[PDB]
Design an enzyme around this catalytic site. Structure first.
Site, mmCIF file in Angstrom:
data_model
loop_
_atom_site.group_PDB
_atom_site.id
_atom_site.type_symbol
_atom_site.label_atom_id
_atom_site.label_comp_id
_atom_site.label_asym_id
_atom_site.label_seq_id
_atom_site.Cartn_x
_atom_site.Cartn_y
_atom_site.Cartn_z
ATOM 1 N N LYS C 157 -26.064 19.963 -24.956
ATOM 2 C CA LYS C 157 -24.606 20.012 -24.968
ATOM 3 C C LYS C 157 -24.104 21.444 -24.838
ATOM 4 C CE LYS C 157 -22.731 18.078 -28.487
ATOM 5 N NZ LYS C 157 -22.506 18.073 -29.958
ATOM 6 N N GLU C 183 -17.465 23.413 -37.927
ATOM 7 C CA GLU C 183 -18.838 23.421 -37.451
ATOM 8 C C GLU C 183 -19.753 24.095 -38.458
ATOM 9 O OE1 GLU C 183 -20.382 22.105 -34.891
ATOM 10 O OE2 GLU C 183 -18.529 21.113 -34.287
ATOM 11 N N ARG C 184 -21.027 23.719 -38.396
ATOM 12 C CA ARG C 184 -22.053 24.472 -39.096
ATOM 13 C C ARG C 184 -22.060 25.902 -38.586
ATOM 14 N NH1 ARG C 184 -22.808 19.564 -37.590
ATOM 15 N NH2 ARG C 184 -23.975 18.029 -38.822
#
Ligand SMILES: Nc1ncnc2c1ncn2[C@@H]1O[C@H](COP(=O)(O)OP(=O)(O)OP(=O)(O)O)[C@@H](O)[C@H]1O
Ligand SMILES: [Mg+2]
Lengths: 50, 370, 234, 147, 147, 234
Positions: C157, C183-184
């Site tokens: 991705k 997000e992480r």
């Protein structure tokens, strides 16, 4: 190893008990000294910061 | 050495929550002291959470039966902090840094504040150095690398604590300092875990931070953040382990579902509005604060790392619940332990079909990757 | 234009302002800290008598109940321009990358803007030329349209994102924006920064053609809420 | 302005006098009991307020209301209630000396001297919400930390 | 101070109301003239406040004293925001005129002035939640009739 | 001491005490209730200026507002020692069997005590033979450890418990304690009495080595809430 750890824990507990007993004795001595001399002498310390 | 401290009066003390009346100029997470009085020779601290107009609602880090209405509280200027350093290795300490194994005082020189901002956005680095769990299924199919937070999610009794303890035991000479945070876990089970760690000589590099079930919900609530601060100090300053400056920490939260339960208890006792499943609204924020502090810093910031292994029990294998989905979203990978696989002889019980590790081969040795 | 904090409950701050100088519904509060920096809040509810309830955008673990607050009048102002290109920003527009702060000469725009009116909308959908065969054949994009990838990690991705940026920057002018919302920090940062800095096209790195705004999970809910609007303004 | 100020002050003084005089008049006595005890020593608004206070029977702290009457003339804020605690019972001379000594704030602030003989020879002075503690019990704990 | 609120507030409001009510009748009086004018059935401080101002001749300001009379035993924050809009910027004597004609709404409550130059003549009086418009209403009513 | 009841909401009684004599969090207060018998409530919360919320642990359906409450100053104290062996007690430690009350010389211990510390924990355990195939094979009954059965309404929890007691109560090598928190007084007790008094260990019945605290389904919520703690104290 467990016996050695138990001995170390017992030594630490004995030191803690000695410290507590010393604190109690110091508190008793300070109380006797305050009863004899009088706490009024500490009133002058009220102006240190207030 | 006389000093002027801010004093408030406990106007309402309940199930571990006290309204502290006038404690103006109190920091939003200070440590109110509750100085000793007649009948109590020690101090019971508390965390001033809600700073409402004309009130300070504070959770109590200890036993609240001693606190009485009208008692004076002195606001220590320090935000909630935990002692850190070399002196905590091999010691069981409650989340306040006070030893509970009775092996003596904790020798320390630095107290790191819990609830710290994340290590940084650009300060991290790609996870490359593996964490050798010692379990073939984990080390081959669901790799864990230094700086990667890997959830261990399963049913009530499937081997989650067993996997965590195996990972902790395996880090004998790999330059790893393990931390085991036991949140809401019964004191006998924490004693069993400590006995297992001592039996295999894994208590020369392990710190156990236990807030058992009997201890107040505030202690369980701050149980992981203490310990996470310990690992932060280890990855940022290092500790002398086996004559080497180890800057790698592996923290295992024994059960984050119990931590969420403790947070729900302290929130509902503070009468904050509930959310889904009666949990407070910001419990995803609760766990994201804790788990995002596990990072692999770059060489400019020290090069250390902190590996997190959260543990979650799911009711009837419902991984669609609120807290399980939140922590699954937060973590970088999941280890699913199933009772069906555990009973069928598959002792590690990993459901390798659904267990995932987003780091992937980068968290494996080139031999293992090949 | 200066009020006083009244209540602090988590990341929600209640602040009482003078009667005639109450901040608007989306203004910034900008609480000044002792150590030089400031805590920029965002108003959410005007209520009471000069009292505004705002979201922290920060920790609020060092704030009393009497600290002054300086209303900025305008909503969260974010730097926009060619200067804010190839740089990483937070929700407030402060550059979180290693390089220096954005100069005062760069235009600052409000985070909250009105979407384009109905008259300006295209009356016919148009395909968006990406260059990828499977994307441009099976699931064509839309000019000014939304597309969602449903994929985990290790499926490329990130490489797809990098190629989309490169293709739009080559065939069109094609500046790109990336807002990592919740997000992480490991995946979103230092595994997107390094991969895009390493990835190169026409001797220009992909990161040089892309703006980044990152509101990660560690940040309070307001930051993750308004990082998308920051990226939209940029 | 000036006329209002004298008027307000006179009204406050009259209210304080009525409260001090008639506080114990309807003190404790219930609504029916203190109705006869309610004398003409109050204004009609003051009489109504006293009747309301003594309807439940809580007409004991009315003197405090009297003390509330004069301070409301000057917007109050002079309470500055401070509390002094010392191990020995305070002698009147030193009590007055320390009362005068805490003049940094408002002078002889409302001070409710206490003893709490668990202390050893020290002062615990709480002004408003700031407490100063030089008691030797505090030093005792600050040395006992060695435990 | 807290106990003062009910009784002191009631007495101050009664004094303010009595002074405001007697302001029309007792205008330009003296001690004896206002004693025969102002009703003596009011509060002991109220009658004194009514007579003393007239004795010194400040009876015209006595009503203004009533304005400060409630605020002496209140937070004095419930002053109507009587906004006055006029295209012509108003001088100090103009603003005094407006406030002195505006005291008929409560007292000399908090009054704010604005320009809105697009008005012509007249003035918009927004007292509490009642608005009186007399400036451009005529022209736009006329344009409604024309259209 | 000498408070007055303000509100009676169910079994929760709110009482106002003097400002300087407020009961502690877990103290026991008492309503004289007339007739020479008193209602013992346990404080749970402190609400403000001398107001405390307590749990009645009794009928609390015939007492009015304004009734006086006397503060004992100590939590619920229950008798402990060999005097409690072979006797049946309430949540309050008052015997309900036909035999006489426990003497004053018997030690009284509070029902609210700190659990054993981390040092005191004993992790040594060994199999306890119970004579039930499924229990002794799949989930061995643990000597010195905690075990429990989780059963629905229609399953035989009571039958399994009674069989376990019959099997392992003769060869105790020690004393035993049975707590009947929220259970039928038909089978849960008064027929365990019949079985325990019938069983004989060398001319000493099993009931002679048992302390039984009841607080069963008929009791109000407070008794069922604190009967477990009373049994644990004994
Ligand atoms: N090879 C194995 N690997 C993992 N678990 C095993 C293995 N062999 C046995 N077990 C089981 O795992 C238990 C260890 O505890 P476990 O890790 O399952 O606890 P847990 O998941 O934390 O559960 P709980 O919520 O009950 O504390 C052992 O008592 C045993 O029942
Ligand atoms: Mg476990």
């Amino acid at each position: 190893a467990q016996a050695e750890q138990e001995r170390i824990r017992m030594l630490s507990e004995a030191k803690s008990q000695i410290a507590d007993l010393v604190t109690l004795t110091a508190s008793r001595v300070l109380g006797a000294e305050l009863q004899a001399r009088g706490h009024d002498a500490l009133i002058a310390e009220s102006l240190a910061a207030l | 050495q006389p000093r002027q401290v801010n004093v408030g009066t406990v106007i309402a003390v309940g199930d571990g929550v006290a309204r502290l009346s006038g404690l103006d100029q109190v920091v939003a997470s200070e440590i109110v002291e509750f100085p000793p009085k007649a009948g109590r020779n020690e101090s019971i601290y508390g965390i001033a959470l809600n700073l409402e107009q004309d009130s300070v609602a504070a959770i109590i880090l200890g036993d609240d039966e001693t606190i009485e209405e009208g008692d004076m509280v002195t606001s220590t200027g320090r935000v909630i902090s935990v002692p850190v350093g070399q002196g905590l290795l091999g010691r069981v300490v409650n989340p306040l840094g006070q030893p509970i194994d009775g092996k003596g005082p904790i020798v320390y020189e630095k107290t790191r504040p819990i609830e710290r901002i994340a290590p940084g956005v650009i300060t991290r680095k790609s996870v490359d150095t593996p964490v050798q769990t010692g379990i073939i299924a984990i080390d081959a199919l669901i790799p864990i690398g230094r700086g990667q937070r890997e959830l261990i999610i399963g049913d009530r009794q499937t081997g989650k604590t067993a996997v965590a303890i195996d990972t902790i035991l395996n880090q004998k000479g790999q330059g790893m300092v393990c931390i085991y945070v036991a949140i809401g876990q019964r004191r006998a089970q924490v004693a069993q875990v400590v006995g297992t760690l001592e039996r295999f000589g894994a208590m020369e590099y392990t710190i156990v931070v236990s807030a058992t079930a009997s201890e107040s919900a505030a202690l369980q609530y701050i149980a992981p953040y203490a310990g996470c601060a310990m690992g932060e100090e280890i990855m940022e300053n290092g500790v002398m382990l086996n004559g080497q400056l180890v800057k790698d920490a592996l923290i295992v939260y024994d059960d984050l579902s119990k931590h969420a339960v403790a947070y729900r208890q302290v929130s509902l006792l503070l009468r904050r509005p509930p959310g889904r499943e009666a949990y407070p609204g910001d419990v995803f924020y609760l766990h994201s604060r804790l788990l995002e502090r596990a990072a692999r810093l770059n060489e400019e910031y020290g090069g250390g790392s902190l590996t997190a292994l959260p543990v979650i029990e799911t009711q009837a294998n419902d991984v669609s619940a609120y807290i399980p989905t939140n922590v699954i979203s937060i973590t970088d990978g999941q280890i699913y332990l199933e009772s069906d696989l555990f009973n069928a002889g598959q002792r590690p019980a990993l459901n390798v079909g659904i267990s995932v590790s987003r780091v992937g081969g980068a968290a494996q040795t080139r031999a293992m990757r090949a | 234009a200066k009020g006083v904090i009244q209540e602090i409950i988590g990341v929600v701050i209640r602040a009482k302002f003078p009667e005639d100088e109450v901040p608007e519904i989306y203004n910034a509060i900008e609480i000044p800290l002792g150590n030089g920096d400031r805590l920029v809040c965002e108003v959410q509810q005007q209520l009471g008598n000069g009292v505004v309830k705002a979201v922290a955008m920060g920790s609020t673990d060092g704030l009393r109940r009497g600290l002054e607050v300086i209303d900025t009048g305008r909503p969260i102002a974010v730097p926009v321009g060619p200067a804010t290109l190839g740089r990483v920003f937070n929700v407030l527009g402060d550059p979180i990358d290693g390089m220096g702060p954005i100069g005062p000469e760069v235009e600052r725009r409000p985070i909250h803007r009105d979407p384009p009116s109905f008259e300006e909308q295209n009356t016919q959908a148009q395909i968006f030329e990406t260059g990828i065969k499977v994307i441009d054949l099976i699931a064509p994009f839309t000019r000014g349209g939304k597309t969602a990838i449903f994929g985990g990690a290790g499926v490329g991705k990130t490489v797809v994102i990098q190629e989309l940026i490169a293709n739009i920057a080559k065939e069109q002018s094609g500046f790109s924006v990336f807002a990592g919302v919740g997000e992480r920090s490991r995946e979103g940062n230092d595994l997107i920064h390094e991969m895009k800095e390493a990835r190169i096209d026409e001797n220009t790195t992909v990161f040089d053609k892309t703006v980044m705004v990152f509101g990660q999970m560690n940040e309070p809910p307001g930051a993750r809420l308004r990082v998308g609007l920051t990226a939209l303004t940029m | 302005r000036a006329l209002a100020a004298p008027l307000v002050e006179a009204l406050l003084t009259t209210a304080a006098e009525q409260i001090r005089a008639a506080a114990p008049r309807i003190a404790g006595l219930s609504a029916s009991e203190a109705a006869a005890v309610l004398p003409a020593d109050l204004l009609p608004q003051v009489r109504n307020f006293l009747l309301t206070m003594a309807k439940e029977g809580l007409t004991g702290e009315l003197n405090a209301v009297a003390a509330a009457l004069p301070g409301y003339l000057e917007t109050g804020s002079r309470a500055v209630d401070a509390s002094v605690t010392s191990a020995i019972e305070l002698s009147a001379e030193q009590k007055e000396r320390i009362t005068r000594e805490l003049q940094q704030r408002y002078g002889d602030v409302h001070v409710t001297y206490h003893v709490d003989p668990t202390l050893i020879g020290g002062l615990i002075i709480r002004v408003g919400d700031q407490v100063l503690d030089n008691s030797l019990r505090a030093r005792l704990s600050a040395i006992q930390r060695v435990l």
